């Protein structure tokens, strides 16, 4: 099943190594634990807001 694999300096542009990271997201019935950021504005006092 396994075959040799590697890279060398002489490899062409399409033959060079590339680091690939996949950030997968899925929603389940369980309560959510991860959530994106969420903003806060500046503070003002002594005036209706």
């Amino acid at each position, epitope marked *: 099943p396994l075959q040799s694999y590697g890279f060398q300096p002489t490899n062409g542009v399409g033959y060079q190594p590339y680091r690939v990271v996949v950030l997968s997201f899925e*929603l*389940l019935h369980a309560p959510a634990t991860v959530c994106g950021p969420k903003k806060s504005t500046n503070l003002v006092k002594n005036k209706c807001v």
Partner: nanobody
Amino acid sequence: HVQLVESGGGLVQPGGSLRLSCAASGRSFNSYLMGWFRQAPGKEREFVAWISGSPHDIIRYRDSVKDRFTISRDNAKNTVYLQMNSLKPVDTAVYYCAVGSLRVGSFSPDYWGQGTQVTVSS
């Protein structure tokens, strides 16, 4: 508890459109996927379509029905909609509404309804 109730069943001509809707109650299903399955009598229930309740709604369909039985949903009402379009006699079946979660990127039904008979005949 969670219950699924169907509505809109009947019989439509080949080429005549229809709509089946199944409302889901009990809990919220924003992390779920709203979907439908159909079972042609005497056969094994085949997928129809599912839709996620997300800002980037993901939709899957079934090969025989892709782009014909449009599917949508509602998050506030927690209901699944199936708009059947330009049907053929081969589309006769009992359509079930499925509520499930996205496990390993595959729609995994968790809760099922009672179904409804949608028939197509000449």
